[PDB]
RNA sequence: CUCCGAACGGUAAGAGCCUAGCAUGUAGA
């Protein structure tokens, strides 16, 4: 979640699962870079 | 340059020819970019091109009072003092509404009251809208007929003082 | 409105009003008092919510 | 209990305050704010022992 | 209400009490009532900082007794 | 014309006297410019006397023009005395004019 | 908006004609109102006909100076516009009136080396 | 713990220097600017000797570059572009009219601009235009006993210099961070941005503490009040690896 | 800032450069300040014709 | 209870450059 820092909170609650995490430069990890299209 | 544009051509009604507006407004209009560009050079056709270039109606805006380009063109026309034929042709030209408004303001400023009425009587039939600048600098929508009726009324506009002769009934009893 | 004398220099930078105003006794008395009676009864009549401008 | 003596000291304490003010500036302040005159010494002020009413 | 003084550099000093939430616009109208000029032709400043009309007094922190600059555009 | 000739005759193009007999600075400039300006108790007193004069004369002018009737000239002369106190020509010139003003306000109270 | 523009131009021309006719009729109505007031003072009613009130532009809201509150005049330079800023009841302490001015020793009018005046409005 | 009159003058200068305490005030002293309401002659010479050199202009510059470096610590997370430390006039902080902001913020892609808001309240309102830029404009002001509300002064100055023509600015939004060097306060109150409130709050904290300009100022005041507790060009020294 | 190559002077403002242009010895070589109006009719006629032709 | 105050004592100190509103009306050949 490095590309979206506004949705990160220290008091935020989240669950876990058994799966493989995506990369830092993945398209699912950076929605703002794909939405920059005029 | 800024003193007078005519050596000896004519005079104003009751003041100096270059001093028709207030002295504070003249000192504020003496320092501007468009005012310096007009004072660097100004002809009759140059004044016509400057009137056809800018279409706006207003005076000074904001705390730092800066003149409008229409007020700068009116000051350059009052300084240069052209003939009555060029002013009548600018008032009669309906192609450029801003040039017609500038000619109407020049005819209401330096002209006689009978000539002002004879020039403002066709001006009341112009229903074309025009852009107007408010006192805070914001743009406002207006028409040429409302500005002509305000110029034919008492002086309430900013940076303008042009009293009439009498009422419409008294002027009709005096002459045509 | 009436009128007055006037003394003008040819320079015309000054014009004093030369007539040292010379009314009569009961005439001026009854004039300004007539204005008093008509003024008070004028206020008696109209609701004239008006005065002049400051300037 | 001597009212004339009470009045004389009041105007004189205001007079000395006026002398301090006309020393501080030169143009005779409209209201020299009463703290930096009448406040205590050790906390960096002038410590007038004021024997006269003056509202803050 | 707070009293302000609008002394000028030509013997033009006026004293006006006005309220706190009131803006510079109504205060210029009240000065215009006081000293005999139009309210839009008053420009009141703090030495090269021109007080704009629409902002209220408590934002400029004008308090009772403070002096303005009275100028004319 | 008289006072404006005095003003422009002192090589000081900073101030423009209102034709309704005020005086206002133009450029928001003083200090050095004010230091050759703020003077002449005689000029301020004479402007004051002509200010009261021109207030009277212009009041009767708009009277004989458009709203003379009986309300305007009467009320305007009365508030012209009360405004010789409150509006124009105040005590900054000479000393005793406050005494004549206070006698004027008291006469207004009686009448 | 040519049709609406012509409609608004006709509305404005009608308003201007009505304003001129209203100025003429307003002169005539001032004359008629003077005549009606005269006739009413003559034979309307002996203390039985008022038909009016106390219409004044600016409000007369006043109070009472506490002990030495200054005679703060509102200034008689603009009184016909009937603005809201004027009606505010100037009977409040500005700078120094907040005090009581009664517990003071004998009296304190002005301590600024300028008490040329000598009075309290008692006599 | 002519000398001692000056020490009294400065240690109560914050109450002895005000228009209310001297009615007809207009002066800006020099350098940064002081509302020296009068002659107050000893205080004037001392305050010039207090603000020793070009120290105020440096204070503005150091606070500006510190705010920029604090922003350059989350620019990528705040979807910025880069350092938009604008150019200004040479003596630019020595004026009181304008605010051509030093630190613009060229956002990465379509930041959402919030309403006018003060940096203490929490009920923000992010429902407005989708601004490409918020600007950071510094303003420094030596207060008094009746000028010591920097927040109200800041909301006033920002809405004024925003509303009036009077001045160039950045695009649509200038969040005006302003700190009053008299009572050491911190303020900004206008168009806040998306999520920048925590940033500016911690920023004003980290700026008010320990910024070398503010330390030089506090030490200069303490020691005055005496109350102790292109490679060929010069000035371009770099390394070559 | 602004630069006048005729006088080779450095103007710190725009009014200083625009003033150095005309209203000085450079103008005295350029014909000083004298400028008149151009006729009456023909200037407004040709000006309105050229303006109306360039507009549309 | 209604007696309303104005100014001076106050803004520095200069360096190089730049622009302006004015004033006299002559004997002479």
The answer to whether the beta carbon of residue G68 comes closer than 7 angstroms to any atom of strand J is yes
Residues 13-52 of chain I within 7 A of strand J, judged by CB, are 15-16, 19-20, 23-24
- Rounded CA-CA distance H27/E69 in Å is 12
DSSP letter for F87, please. Answer: T
Which residue do the tokens 């002990």 mark? Answer: G67
Q: Which residues of D touch H12 (CB under 8 A)?
A: 35-36, 44-45
Number of domains forming the structure of chain H: 1
Contact B137, B125 (CB under 8 A): no
H92 within a domain of the structure (yes/no):
yes
Indicate the burial class of C27 (C-beta count within 10 angstroms; 0-12, 13-18, 19 or more).
Answer: exposed
Q: Is B89 on the interface with I (CB under 8 A)?
A: yes
**Subunit contact C13:F87, Cβ cutoff 8 A:** no
H234 within a domain of the structure (yes/no):
no
Nearest-Cα residue of chain E relative to residue H94: E48
**Subunit contact C52:F20, Cβ cutoff 8 A:** no
Q: Which two tokens stand for residue F97?
A: 């004019």
Q: Which residues pair with H191 in a beta bridge?
A: H116
- Rounded CA-CA distance E12/E35 in Å is 8
Distance I2 CA to J18 C1' (A): 11
Resolution (A): 8.0
Q: CB within 8 A of H48, min separation 6: which ones?
A: H29, H30, H31
Q: CB within 8 A of B69, min separation 6: which ones?
A: B34, B50, B54, B56
> If contacts are CB pairs under 8 Å, which of residues 86-145 in chain H contact chain A?
108-109
Closest CA to H62 of H209, H214, H224: H214
Distance E12 CA to J7 C1' (A): 11
Q: Which two tokens stand for residue E50?
A: 């021109």
Q: Containing H/E element for H214?
A: helix H212-225
Residues 24-63 of chain F within 7 A of strand J, judged by CB, are 30-32, 34-35, 38
Closest CA to E71 of B164, C1, F24: F24
Touching partners of D (3+ C-beta pairs < 8 Å): G, H
B127 → closest Cβ in G6, G23, G24:
G6
E32 → closest Cβ in G72, G78, G94:
G78
H171 within a domain of the structure (yes/no):
yes
Closest CA to G20 of C53, B114, B171, F65: B171
Closest CA to H154 of H145, H143, H165: H143
With CA of I9 and C1' of each nucleotide, the nearest comes out as J17
- Rounded CA-CA distance F64/F55 in Å is 14
Contact G86, G110 (CB under 8 A): no
- Rounded CA-CA distance B103/B77 in Å is 9
Which nucleotides on chain J have any atom < 7 A from a protein Cβ? 1-13, 16-22
Q: CB within 8 A of H120, min separation 6: which ones?
A: H151
Strands C7-8 and B139-143: unpaired
Q: Containing H/E element for B132?
A: strand B129-133
H123 within a domain of the structure (yes/no):
yes
Contact H4, H231 (CB under 8 A): no
Instruction: Give backbone dihedrals phi and psi of B112, rounded to 5 degrees, phi first.
Output: -75, 165
Q: Is F21 left (phi over 0), alpha (psi -120 to 50) or beta?
A: left
Give the gap in angstroms from C-alpha D14 to the nearest C-alpha of chain G.
8
- Rounded CA-CA distance H201/H215 in Å is 20
H40 within a domain of the structure (yes/no):
yes
With CA of G119 and C1' of each nucleotide, the nearest comes out as J3
Indicate the burial class of C5 (C-beta count within 10 angstroms; 0-12, 13-18, 19 or more).
Answer: exposed
Q: What is the DSSP string of E2-68?
A: EEEE---TTS---EEEE-SS-BHHHHHHHHHHHHTS-STTEEEESSS-B--SSSBHHHHT--TT-B-
Instruction: Give backbone dihedrals phi and psi of B80, rounded to 5 degrees, phi first.
Output: -75, -35
Touching partners of G (3+ C-beta pairs < 8 Å): B, C, D, E, F
Q: What's the CATH code of the domain at H172?
A: 3.90.1570.40
Report the b/e string of H230-241 with b at 16+ CB within 10 A: eeeeeeeeeeee
Give the gap in angstroms from C-alpha B104 to the nearest C-alpha of chain E.
25
Three-state DSSP at B23 gives: helix
**Subunit contact C51:F72, Cβ cutoff 8 A:** yes
**Which site among E16, E23, E49 would you substitute to test the H interface, given the most H Cβ atoms closer than 10 Å to its Cβ?**
E49
Contact E16, E27 (CB under 8 A): yes
H8 within a domain of the structure (yes/no):
no
Which residue do the tokens 């008492």 mark? Answer: B154
Asked whether at least 3 C-beta pairs link C and A within 8 Å, the reply is no
Which method was used?
A: cryo-EM
H172 within a domain of the structure (yes/no):
yes
Touching partners of I (3+ C-beta pairs < 8 Å): B
Instruction: Give backbone dihedrals phi and psi of H52, rounded to 5 degrees, phi first.
Output: -55, -60
H206 within a domain of the structure (yes/no):
yes
The answer to whether the beta carbon of residue H23 comes closer than 7 angstroms to any atom of strand J is yes
Give the gap in angstroms from C-alpha E64 to the nearest C-alpha of chain B.
24
Map chain C to HEC letters: CCCCCCEECCCCCCEECCCCCCCCHHHHHHHHHHHHHHHHHHHHHCCCCCCCCCC
Which residue do the tokens 């404006």 mark? Answer: F4
| Cα Dmax for chain G | 81
- Which residues form the domain of H174? 27-228
> If contacts are CB pairs under 8 Å, which of residues 1-56 in chain I contact chain B?
14-15, 18, 21-23, 33, 35, 37-41, 43-48, 50-52, 55
**Subunit contact B127:G13, Cβ cutoff 8 A:** no
Contact E68, E51 (CB under 8 A): yes
- Rounded CA-CA distance B168/G20 in Å is 8
Strands H133-136 and H174-175: parallel
With CA of F9 and C1' of each nucleotide, the nearest comes out as J22
**Subunit contact B82:I37, Cβ cutoff 8 A:** yes
Q: CB within 8 A of I20, min separation 6: which ones?
A: I4, I6, I7, I9, I11, I26
Count interface pairs D-G at CB distance under 8 A: 16
Indicate the burial class of B51 (C-beta count within 10 angstroms; 0-12, 13-18, 19 or more).
Answer: buried
């Amino acid at each position: 979640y490095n590309f979206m820092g506004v949705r990160h909170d220290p008091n935020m609650k989240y669950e876990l699962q058994l799966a493989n995490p995506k990369e830092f430069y993945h398209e699912v990890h950076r929605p703002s870079h794909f939405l920059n299209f005029a | 340059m800024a003193n007078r544009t005519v050596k000896d051509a004519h005079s104003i009604h009751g003041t100096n020819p270059q001093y028709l507006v207030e002295k504070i407004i003249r000192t504020r209009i003496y320092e501007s970019k468009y005012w310096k560009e007009e004072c660097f050079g100004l002809t009759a056709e140059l004044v016509v091109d400057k009137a056809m270039e800018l279409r706006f109606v207003g005076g000074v805006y904001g705390g730092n009072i800066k003149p409008t380009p229409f007020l700068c063109l009116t000051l350059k026309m009052l300084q240069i003092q052209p003939e009555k034929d060029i002013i009548v042709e600018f008032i009669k030209n309906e192609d450029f509404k801003y040039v017609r408004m500038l000619g109407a303001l020049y005819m209401r400023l330096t002209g006689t009251a009978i000539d002002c009425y004879k020039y403002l009587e066709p001006l009341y039939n112009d229903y074309r809208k025009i852009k107007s600048q408010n006192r805070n600098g914001e743009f406002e929508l207006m028409h040429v007929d409302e500005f002509i009726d305000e110029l034919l009324h008492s002086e309430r506009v900013c940076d303008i003082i042009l009293p009439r002769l009498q009422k419409r009934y008294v002027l009709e009893e005096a002459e045509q | 409105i009436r009128d007055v004398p006037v003394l003008y220099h040819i320079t015309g930078a000054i014009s004093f009003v030369n007539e040292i105003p010379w009314v009569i006794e009961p005439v001026y008395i009854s004039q300004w008092g007539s204005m008093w009676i008509m003024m008070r009864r004028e206020k008696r009549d109209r609701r004239h919510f008006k005065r002049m401008r400051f300037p | 209990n001597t009212q004339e003596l009470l009045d004389l000291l009041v105007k004189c304490e205001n007079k000395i305050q006026t002398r301090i003010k006309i020393g501080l500036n030169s143009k005779m302040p409209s209201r020299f704010p009463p703290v930096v005159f009448y406040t205590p010494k050790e906390l960096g002020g002038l410590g007038m022992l004021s024997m006269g009413h003056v509202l803050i | 209400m707070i009293e302000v003084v609008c002394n000028d550099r030509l013997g033009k000093k006026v004293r006006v009490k006005c309220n706190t939430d009131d803006t510079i616009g109504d205060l210029k109208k009240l000065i215009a009532a006081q000293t005999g000029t139009r309210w839009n032709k008053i420009v009141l400043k703090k030495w090269y900082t021109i007080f704009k009309d629409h902002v209220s007094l408590g934002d400029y922190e004008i308090h009772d007794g403070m002096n303005l600059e009275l100028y004319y555009q | 014309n008289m006072l404006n000739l005095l003003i422009h005759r002192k090589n000081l193009n900073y101030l423009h006297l209102d034709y309704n007999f005020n005086l206002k600075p133009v450029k928001t400039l003083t200090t050095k410019e004010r230091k050759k300006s703020r003077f002449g108790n005689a000029f301020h007193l004479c402007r004051e006397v002509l200010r009261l004069t021109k207030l009277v004369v212009d009041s009767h002018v708009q009277y004989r023009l458009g709203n003379v009737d009986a309300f305007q000239l009467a009320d305007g002369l009365q508030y012209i005395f009360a405004h010789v106190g409150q509006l124009t020509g105040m005590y900054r010139y000479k000393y005793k004019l406050m005494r004549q003003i206070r006698m004027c306000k008291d006469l207004k109270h009686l009448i | 908006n040519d049709e609406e523009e012509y409609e608004a131009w006709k509305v404005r021309e009608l308003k201007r004609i009505k304003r001129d006719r209203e100025d003429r009729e307003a002169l005539e109505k001032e004359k008629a109102e003077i005549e009606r007031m005269r006739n009413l003072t003559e034979e309307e009613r002996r203390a039985e006909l008022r038909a009016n009130g106390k219409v004044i532009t600016n409000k007369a809201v006043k109070g009472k100076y506490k002990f030495l509150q200054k005679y703060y005049h509102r200034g008689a330079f603009f009184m016909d516009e009937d603005e809201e800023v004027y009606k505010r009841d100037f009977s409040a302490p500005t700078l120094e009136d907040h005090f009581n001015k009664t517990i003071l020793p004998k009296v304190m009018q002005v301590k600024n080396f300028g008490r040329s005046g000598r009075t309290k409005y008692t006599h | 713990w002519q000398i001692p009159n000056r020490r009294f003058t400065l240690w109560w200068s914050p109450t002895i220097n005000r228009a209310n305490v001297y009615v007809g005030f207009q002066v800006q002293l020099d350098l940064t600017g002081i509302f020296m309401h009068g002659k107050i002659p000893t205080l004037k010479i001392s305050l010039i000797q207090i603000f020793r050199a070009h120290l105020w202009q440096k204070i503005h510059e150091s606070i500006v570059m510190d705010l920029c470096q604090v922003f350059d610590q989350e620019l990528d997370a705040l979807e910025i572009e880069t350092v938009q430390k604008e150019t200004i006039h040479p003596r630019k902080s020595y004026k009181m009219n304008s605010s051509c902001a030093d630190i613009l913020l060229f956002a990465s892609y379509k930041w959402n601009v919030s309403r006018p808001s003060l940096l203490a309240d929490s009920k923000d309102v992010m429902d407005s235009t989708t601004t490409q830029k918020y600007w950071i404009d510094i303003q420094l002001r030596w207060g008094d006993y009746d000028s010591h509300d920097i927040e109200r002064y800041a909301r006033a100055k920002f809405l004024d210099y925003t509303t009036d023509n009077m001045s160039i600015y950045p695009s649509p939004t200038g969040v005006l961070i302003a700190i009053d060097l008299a009572y050491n306060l911190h303020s900004a109150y206008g168009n806040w941005f998306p999520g920048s409130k925590p940033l500016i709050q911690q920023a004003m904290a980290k700026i008010m503490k320990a910024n070398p300009a503010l330390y030089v100022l506090r030490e200069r005041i303490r020691k005055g009040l005496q109350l102790y507790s292109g490679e060929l060009f010069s000035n371009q020294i770099i390394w070559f690896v | 800032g602004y630069y006048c190559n005729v006088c080779d002077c450095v103007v710190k403002d725009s009014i200083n450069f625009l003033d150095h242009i005309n209203g000085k010895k450079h103008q005295r070589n350029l014909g000083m300040s004298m400028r008149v109006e151009r006729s009456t009719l023909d200037q407004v006629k040709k000006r309105f014709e050229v303006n109306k032709k360039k507009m549309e």
